[PDB]
Amino acid sequence: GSFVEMVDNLRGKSGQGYYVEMTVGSPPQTLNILVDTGSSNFAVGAAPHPFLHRYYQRQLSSTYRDLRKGVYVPYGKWEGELGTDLVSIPHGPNVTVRANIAAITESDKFFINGSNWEGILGLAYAEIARPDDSLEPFFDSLVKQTHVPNLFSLQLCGAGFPLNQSEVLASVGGSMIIGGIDHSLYTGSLWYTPIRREWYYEVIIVRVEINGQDLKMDCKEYNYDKSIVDSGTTNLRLPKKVFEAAVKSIKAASSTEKFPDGFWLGEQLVCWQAGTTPWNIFPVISLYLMGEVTNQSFRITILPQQYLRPVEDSQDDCYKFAISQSSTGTVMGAVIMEGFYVVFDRARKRIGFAVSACHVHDEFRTAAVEGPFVTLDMEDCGYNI
Ligand SMILES: COc1nc(N2C[C@H]3C(=O)N(C)C(=N)N[C@@]3(c3ccc(F)cc3F)C2)nc(C)c1F
């Protein structure tokens, strides 16, 4: 329904991540925590680091419990010490839970200078928790210990322009609704895709279009080796072969302007005179997802206002191409999530999408969530082995 206490509780941006305020320990220690649907550990800075202005001080918490076990995570990388403590979300459900916490003591290229977050809240399933699936993730603890419904929803709000150091701290970056769906955060209908398996938030893509033109690849290629929804990734990441076909089609649709190789590789910015970004030359991208009804799919459509990420250069409007290659499957990252209100319905093993009330668009085109479409043999789109 309406969850006013949680609306507008996020800050950040697609390139540095979106974070929520949390408290750990007794008395409570306030920390900003990155919302990550791509991992399943709650891990916080617990020792001085040049990029941290605060960290979890276990010796100052009367409710700290030492699990006497280390955790080593090479992905960047971080190392820590496992323990439990009382955790709350001030702009969240009015509950306090006893949760696992990985106290980060050593790290390399993990913390981002100026991101304003000091830890990560892994919201995915126990299967991918470190060191193993016996370390209960935060959300599992929250549901087990309280009457909070087994569901959360995310509205990540891209500003559509660069935010400087002060503006990003003062700006609302979106909402994380814990235990519900807030109807003010979306327009139109919510469409649901099944969660294929509970590890990452794995989904099945059944068709891809660029300006309505079918990419026409065997649908197994779109999900090779998996397709996931990940708020902790900036870009829309596509499998190598899919990325090559998609970039060729996006280049062909936008061919009235020639961009350098570095732009298409997501490395180099492109700039236009203030207000003149030629949105209309870039195509919309539609991803069709498996529906909840047999032989039915629906589509989510994004604009270049989602896949062109605003960056500072001057008075020019500058962007980086936020679609990149992957060797680990499709990743529907923040730049795709910015177009939609996304419902992680764990209780019903499904993910919902609706057009976000905060998506960036122009007067001629909008993001969309539409259906149904008749789609056959959708289970064949899923990859095995
Ligand atoms: C919290 O614990 C664990 N965390 C991770 N992560 C893997 C990282 C990554 O590559 N992506 C795409 C991701 N989505 N998240 C991460 C992440 C996100 C934003 C960021 F600025 C830094 C990050 F490191 C964090 N992986 C395991 C197994 C963890 F146990």
Domain segments of the chain: what residues? Answer: 18-148, 149-385
Structural contact between residues 90 and 55, judged by C-beta atoms closer than 8 angstroms: no
**Amino acid residing at 114:** G
| Catalytic machinery residues | 36, 230
Within a 13 Å sphere around the CA of 45, how many CA atoms are in the beta-carbon half? 23
**CATH of segment(s) 149-385:** 2.40.70.10
Q: Measure 228 CA to ligand 1 centroid, in angstroms.
A: 14
> Which residue of 18, 35, 39 sits with most ligand 1 atoms within 8 Å of its CB, as the best mutation to test the pocket?
39
Q: Measure 260 CA to ligand 1 centroid, in angstroms.
A: 31
Resolution in A: 1.7
Q: Measure 334 CA to ligand 1 centroid, in angstroms.
A: 14
Place domain 18-148 in its CATH homologous superfamily. Acid Proteases (2.40.70.10)
Q: Which helix (H) or strand (E) holds 246?
A: helix 240-253
The closest residue, in CA terms, to atom 13 on ligand 1 is 232
**Atom of ligand 1 at shortest distance to CA of 231?**
14
Same fold, 18-148 and 149-385: yes
Q: Measure 71 CA to ligand 1 centroid, in angstroms.
A: 14
Taking CB atoms within 8 Å and a gap of at least 24, the contacts of 373-379 are 373/288, 373/296, 373/297, 373/298, 373/299, 374/295, 374/296, 375/206, 375/207, 375/288, 375/290, 375/291, 375/295, 375/296, 375/297, 376/295, 378/204, 378/206, 378/219, 378/290, 378/295, 378/297
Task: Give the integer Cα–Cα distance in Å for 63 and 41.
Answer: 20
The closest residue, in CA terms, to atom 4 on ligand 1 is 39
**Atom of ligand 1 at shortest distance to CA of 37?**
14
Q: Is residue 94 packed enough to be buried (19+ CB in 10 Å), middle (13-18) or exposed (0-12)?
A: exposed
The closest residue, in CA terms, to atom 18 on ligand 1 is 232
Task: Give the integer Cα–Cα distance in Å for 197 and 204.
Answer: 10
SS3 252: helix
Query: Pairing between strand 65-74 and 29-36?
Result: unpaired
> Which residue of 120, 139, 324 sits with most ligand 1 atoms within 8 Å of its CB, as the best mutation to test the pocket?
120
Give the method of determination.
X-ray
Question: Which tokens belong to 55?
Answer: 């960290």
Terminal alpha carbon distance of the chain: 41
